C-alpha cells in the first residue's frame, strides 16, 4: 500500500515549528482542541442527518472516546463524527491556507496565550504541544478509511489504511507522545484536564482502561 | 412604561400565518426548535466569555429551565444565554429580511416536513403552532431588559422592562399556549418530547414543577 506525499502550505510549517518550539507551561490545552473538534464533526453528521438519516447508520452511537497505549507511547482520540475523505485530509489538514494562521503567530508574539489557538481556527496544530509525530485515521461514508500522517516537518503523507481496525465511521487522532509529556497517558490526569475544560460537551466522553485480574 | 411599534418585514407576516394556520400534525416539534435557540444563546455567551471572563458574572450558571404556568395558560422557555439588547430584539426578531423566509415557504408549498424549518434559518416562527401570542423578555449585559410581543399580527412592540422578574443575563420565551395545545402545560408530555428530539444538549434541561404538600 503506497504513500503519497503532499507539502504543507508555508505558514502552517512556519505555525508547526512556532508550537513543537515553545517553552510553554498550559501544555494540557492540546485535549480540550482534540475534544473541540471531535465535537464539531459529531455535530456536522448529525446535522447532516436531519435530511439524510441513512448517513448514521455505518455507526449509530455518537461518541468520543480517550485510549492511552503506553507500551506504545501514544494515545488515541477517537469520535463517530464525520470523517474526512481523502480529498479532504489532503485540502483541510495542510495543503490549503488557515484564514487564522499568519494572525495566531502575530498575536502570539504579542504575547498572547496558546490557549487562544482554537479561536483562530487553527487549533488543531496544538498536538503538537505533547506529540513529535501524529496518525490521523478517518472513514467518511464517502470514501474509504486513509491515514494522514505528520511529524511537523514540511510534508505530510496520505495512505489507503490496510493495517488500523475498521472505524465504522469518524476520525481516530493518534498522538505518538514525547519522551516528556508521558503524563497524558494516565488516567488520573486525563480525567483532571476532561473536567477542566471540557465541561459542556454534549456527547459522552468514554476514557478505555487497562487493569489487572487480581 | 411607554411601547414602541415596528412592523414585521413582509416575508415574515407571510410566514408566520402559513404556521398559524396550519392543520399540521407535529407540532411538538416547536419545543426542540426553542431548546436549539437557547443551546445556541448559551454557545455564544461560553464562546464569548473565553476572551471576555466577566461576561459570565451577571449569571454565572449556564441552564435551560422549562416552567408551566397552567392558570395563565402559560409555558415559559428560558435560558442564561447571551441575551438581546433593544436594537438586536427589533433587528433579529423581525424588522430585517432573513435568508431562508421565501425558500422555506416555497419548500413548505412543494411538500416539505414543517421540521425542516430550523434548516432554513426561521426556526424561531414555529412557536406559532401552539401559541397566539409571545412575549421574548431578554436581558443582554449590554443593556436594560426589554420585552418584545407578538400576536402574528404586522406588528410588534418593544416595551422596557419594568413588570418582569430580573434575569441575571438571557431570555424568556413566554408563550401563550392555544385552548387545544394545553397538553404542553403538563409535566410528562413536557418530558416524553425532550427526550425525544433534545437528546444532544450540553447544557442542563431544568423542569419546574408545582406538587401540593399532602
Ligand atoms: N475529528 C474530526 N473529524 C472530522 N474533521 C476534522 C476533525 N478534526 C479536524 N477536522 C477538520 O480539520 C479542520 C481544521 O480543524 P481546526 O484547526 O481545529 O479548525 P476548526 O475551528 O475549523 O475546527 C476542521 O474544520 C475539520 O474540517
Ligand atoms: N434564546 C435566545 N437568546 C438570544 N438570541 C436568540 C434566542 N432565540 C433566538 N435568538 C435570536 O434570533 C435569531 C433567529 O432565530 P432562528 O429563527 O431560530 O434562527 P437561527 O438559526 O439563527 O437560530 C437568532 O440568530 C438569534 O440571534
Excluded: C
Excluded at 481523502?86 to 489538514?93: H, P, V
Excluded at 479561536?119 to 488543531?124: K, L, P, R, S, T
Excluded at 478509511?145 to 514540511?154: D, F, K, P, T, V
Aim: aromatic share 8%; glycine share 6%.
Amino acid at each position: 500500500m503506497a504513500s503519497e506525499t503532499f507539502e504543507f502550505q508555508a505558514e502552517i510549517t512556519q505555525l508547526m515549528s512556532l508550537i513543537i518550539n515553545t517553552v510553554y507551561s498550559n501544555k494540557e490545552i492540546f485535549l480540550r482542541e482534540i475534544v473541540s473538534n471531535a465535537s464539531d464533526a459529531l455535530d456536522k453528521i448529525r446535522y447532516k442527518s436531519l435530511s439524510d438519516p441513512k448517513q448514521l447508520e455505518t455507526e449509530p452511537d455518537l461518541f468520543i472516546r480517550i485510549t492511552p497505549k503506553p507500551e506504545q507511547k501514544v494515545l488515541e482520540i477517537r469520535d463517530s463524527g464525520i470523517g474526512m475523505t481523502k480529498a479532504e485530509l489532503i485540502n483541510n489538514l495542510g495543503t490549503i491556507a488557515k484564514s487564522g494562521t499568519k494572525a495566531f503567530m502575530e498575536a502570539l508574539s504579542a504575547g498572547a496565550d496558546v490557549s487562544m489557538i482554537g479561536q483562530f481556527g487553527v487549533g488543531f496544530y496544538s498536538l503538537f504541544l505533547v506529540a513529535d509525530r501524529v496518525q490521523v485515521i478517518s472513514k467518511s461514508n464517502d470514501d474509504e478509511q486513509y491515514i494522514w500522517e505528520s511529524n511537523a516537518g514540511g510534508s505530510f503523507t496520505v495512505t489507503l489504511d490496510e493495517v488500523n481496525e475498521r472505524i465504522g465511521r469518524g476520525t481516530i487522532l493518534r498522538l505518538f507522545l514525547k519522551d516528556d509529556q508521558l503524563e497524558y497517558l494516565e488516567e488520573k490526569r486525563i480525567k483532571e484536564v476532561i473536567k477542566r475544560h471540557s465541561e459542556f460537551v454534549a456527547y459522552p466522553i468514554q476514557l478505555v482502561v487497562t487493569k489487572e485480574v487480581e
